[PDB]
Amino acid sequence: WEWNVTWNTSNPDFTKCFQNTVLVWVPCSYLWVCFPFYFLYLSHHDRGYIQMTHLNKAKTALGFLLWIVCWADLFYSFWLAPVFLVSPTLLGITMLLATFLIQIERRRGVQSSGIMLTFWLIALLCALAILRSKIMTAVFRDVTFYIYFSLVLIQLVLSCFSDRSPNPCPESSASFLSRITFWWITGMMVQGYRQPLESTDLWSLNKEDTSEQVVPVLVKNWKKECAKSRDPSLFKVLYKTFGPYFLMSFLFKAVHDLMMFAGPEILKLLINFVAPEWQGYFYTALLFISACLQTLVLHQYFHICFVSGMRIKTAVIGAVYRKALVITNAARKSSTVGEIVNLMSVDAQRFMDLATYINMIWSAPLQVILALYLLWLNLGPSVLAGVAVMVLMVPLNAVMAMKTKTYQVAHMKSKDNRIKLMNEILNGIKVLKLYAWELAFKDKVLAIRQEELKVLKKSAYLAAVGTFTWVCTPFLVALSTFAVYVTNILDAQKAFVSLALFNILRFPLNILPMVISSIVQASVSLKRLRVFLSHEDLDPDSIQRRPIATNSITVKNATFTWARNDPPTLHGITFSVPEGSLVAVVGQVGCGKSSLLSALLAEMDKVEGHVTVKGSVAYVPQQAWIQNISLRENILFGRQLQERYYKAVVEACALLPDLEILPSGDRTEIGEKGVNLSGGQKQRVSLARAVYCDSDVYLLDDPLSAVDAHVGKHIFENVIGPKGLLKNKTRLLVTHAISYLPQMDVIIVMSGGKISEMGSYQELLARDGAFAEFLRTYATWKLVEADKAQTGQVKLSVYWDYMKAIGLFISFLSIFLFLCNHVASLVSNYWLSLWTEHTQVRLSVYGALGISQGITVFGYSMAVSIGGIFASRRLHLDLLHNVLRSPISFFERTPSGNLVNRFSKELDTVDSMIPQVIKMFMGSLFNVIGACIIILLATPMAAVIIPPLGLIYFFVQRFYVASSRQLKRLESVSRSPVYSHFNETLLGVSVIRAFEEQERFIRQSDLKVDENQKAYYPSIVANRWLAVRLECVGNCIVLFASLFAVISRHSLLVGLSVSYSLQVTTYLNWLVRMSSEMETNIVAVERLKEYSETEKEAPWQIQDMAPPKDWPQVGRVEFRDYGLRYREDLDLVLKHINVTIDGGEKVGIVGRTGAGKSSLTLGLFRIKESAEGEIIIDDINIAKIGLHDLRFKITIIPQDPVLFSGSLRMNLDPFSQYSDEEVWTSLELAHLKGFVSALPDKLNHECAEGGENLSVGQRQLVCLARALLRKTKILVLDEATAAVDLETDDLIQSTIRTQFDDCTVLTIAHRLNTIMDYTRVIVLDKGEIQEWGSPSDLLQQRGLFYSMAKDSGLV
């Protein structure tokens, strides 16, 4: 090796020894270092074995022949030079390793081999170099090399084709080149360019990325962690679950780092070249191939990080779902629904963000410590000053990082609260609007959001300070280093060969703050998720659930408690129910009857006892849980359809007439929460679902409380009673009605939480006890609309909405600071680059401009972020207004997964992602403008080609967004259902656990997450594909310029026209990518604004048509016809009703279940707009009155008692306009004073999510108490005495008559004994007033009211 023949001569020729040693050691060596490592992948990852094909054999045979040929050389050498022995033998054995490797790759099922192809490419290049040398030299050993080269070339061509396999994702069958360049998606790219992409065009998820192949692994690792603990560290299972695949990104990152620092070296040598021409010709090809390899390796790395992050999100969502399924009630109360929604919606987004920066945590300092080494051999140990200054920032910024962490914690917590509150608003929206409480809860959510945004603003301030100090650190590194060095000297050369590296070193310092912020957010997320996954899970084992002694349900001294901290609810429970025995659990409000049933379901923590429940359990919750599936799928509940039994169950449960009056019968969609159905129909559907599932034990909790006497008797005789379908099954019937007690085989009285009395009706009527006194006293359609993805470019109105929310001043402040920051850098660059009194009057200028840059970097960092606070403060508020203003029909048709999506994930994207992405987009755009100015001032003749360079880039940008947006849109549209499922799963956890349908719901959640990732994975693959092409465009303008600067070296600066072209292509690549990122992120604002155009309710307050202050003073409600139609696709439910309710008239709207009684109440409050007719209350038409002017003047006690999570006093009046003394009085007339007073927290008692902390009787009492609090001249009593005992029932009626004595009251009830005291009643059968007079007159008429009183036992 000497420079005369290798570099100095115009003939590019290697030396003979170099040819025979290094050129042969390179490829053989590559396979030797990779071979061992490759067994790891070949072993850990398997896909079967490929069959015997001609291609595989062709490759194997050529591997055998190639080895022979190489050993044939050793034979001829055996037949002086030392290299003529070792080299042929080494090549033969590495060749024997190559053929063995394709053999084992066949065995392990790999169609395209990256190793073989790259290995053959390197061998080919080495052979090409020797080939050219051997053909320039000119039989004996040359012909062996020609045979070797031809065989190697054919082997390389063969290695490109993909072998046979052992809406599929093309990656599973793509060739090696297709996957290294992400070509397997280009088909969807052009498709997505001709028509908008839909979910149908999207490919099915890869097997490795599928939820049921990812979540289980994480669950198993977590279970192994917990076993070791008996705290379990979530981080341990994380890398024990995601490192085996992620660690290859370390190799890709290292290779990319090495080659990205090697590239500029080649650039500098090339621009120094403009040294025989060949030198530059080689220089440009080497630079081109190194750049292309850099892009490919960096981009496969990015893909690995993104796929690992997506798998992390899938695993986190699945684990959260499973834990929520197995969670206990105490932990479920502790970890609110908002917290679970945050964990599964944006907590894994933090991990996804981390996945891109967890590889930079070691790369940044690697480049840093190298630059110090480059600077060292450049200058000397004076850098001790520089390293110290850089080190000083680490703790200083870490201190702030710690502070930021706290903020994030608080922030995350505030977020949970907000989401939890929103969930309550979604669940009790009908009650919220009926009570005119939309404004109060809007203000509550606004206060929570303001607190969360203040915390986020402080966190953004600290992040801006950290970014500022990190950006000013390198300027200090230099300033301090030169400062100590002067006290050799700083020759313009030595001094400035150090400044260039300082700029190179400032890259990691600029990227660090992002890494720190992502790590802090991911650490907070890990903490929240580890705390959740470590929550106590209820033990089913506690209830010996023996399969089918004959004592179906036996209990021995059970002390069940809802939580360990709280006192036990069940005190010494002990009873034994024989098989097939009808059991009624009677009692007053809040005595643990539903607690007893949930204790038999293992939903209650057992302090001590022995409970054995034998046989399958079928449970019906007092509040019926209904999913979005139709009635047939609700009754089936994932069961095989048997028409003979399904029809019998439907007919027996008195559900047939309701199906007759339903539009599509039993196939019509039923709504997210059963809001389509009535209370009685909901209860009947839940009971029929339990009955159809043939179980051995049926725990019925008030299944006939919301149905009339006739339908209740029909159901009991045909389903529950001794002559019903359930006659052979043990049945625990928790009921308050005592009409069916004589039929009961065993009656258990639950008083104070314990078994006060046990026996039959005839046994308890002779004991002469408390229950004896109680008995003596006798007192398809497709309703839901799924999320829709917009088809087209996002409207510029969305960008305007995000800009006008930020504000004019903040927007220009930010644009001006961006422009100033990038101008300052360009001045600093021009002051150093071209202009390279120097000491003190030039290096200082570099520091001065540099500091002037950092402050501006700080400036917009504090200007965009606060803008992100402003817009998120507006975008949410309008949304919070827009959602509430929407009518009840909107919440009916829109599932509670779109509304949660806007408030959880799209809002999060608006909060944090969009401001940062806007910041980076503005930075890239101004960088491109600055580069355009730079290359315009220098060589203005080149300005002709500047627009074309941009034009082509523009086209690529367009060609990409037309697909990319849709993918993002589809991702959001594919994410809305998942939330819904969680909500549904969170609403009916007890039902799912009791029916043992946990596995089916787990599979449904896996399917929904699989759809979401089917939408999301093509998005990241699209980013990679676009990026490869964009960077390749640059590398093919760098090489092309590098070519045109070496073709014009002695002709009319060319060398700076490459280093200009490359920088302009880079800036352009970043610009096209960041514009695509901003365009995709604006989809979040476009989904938030989607609800703005949604039709909403009538104006809340009509100023002109305001009623008098004392408007309902008479309360003379007068319907004219008031036809009611929920949607303009169904039949009327209030066809031509004419009532003339007088002032202060006790009127009772009684009728059969599902007749339209509560539709009257919904129409009185204008909740559902009238189809034909009007209501003139006190000579004032409500159609004309303002919405609040109507709803604030009329009280209602809703059928479904919903208590929003929070303080009990907050539930009684969220407006907080009643004094605590008055609220105490209102609780006293509700017969709840004792219960609230024995509570440890008194009125500040925290109600659970949806009020589950209280019994439904106590929730009805709370509704009555808040009705007493309002107490206007119109009271609507929508079945208030529906799930309360007879003693409480009469107490409620007594106080109602007492307090509501001079106000018009419209009472809908199935208990006719509460309506006989009413002056007149309204009888409803099919939305028609059949009988309209006094109850005595109707009884004389012997009509339908008489019959209803007959089934009620009142005659």
Ligand SMILES: Nc1ncnc2c1ncn2[C@@H]1O[C@H](COP(=O)(O)OP(=O)(O)OP(=O)(O)O)[C@@H](O)[C@H]1O
């Ligand atoms: N939110 C709703 N949207 C559309 N239709 C509904 C809704 N709620 C009930 N319906 C339907 O309207 C009809 C009357 O319902 P409504 O609840 O007014 O009857 P009801 O006799 O008062 O019932 P219940 O006895 O259970 O209180 C039924 O066909 C019912 O399924």
Ligand SMILES: Nc1ncnc2c1ncn2[C@@H]1O[C@H](COP(=O)(O)OP(=O)(O)OP(=O)(O)O)[C@@H](O)[C@H]1O
């Ligand atoms: N999830 C819960 N956590 C804690 N306490 C609860 C919970 N659910 C109910 N309770 C309380 O436990 C007691 C008994 O509740 P339970 O619903 O079993 O009573 P009940 O007599 O069956 O009610 P109802 O008369 O309304 O049918 C009440 O004080 C109630 O507020």
Ligand SMILES: [Mg+2]
């Ligand atoms: Mg109950």
Ligand SMILES: [Mg+2]
């Ligand atoms: Mg009703």
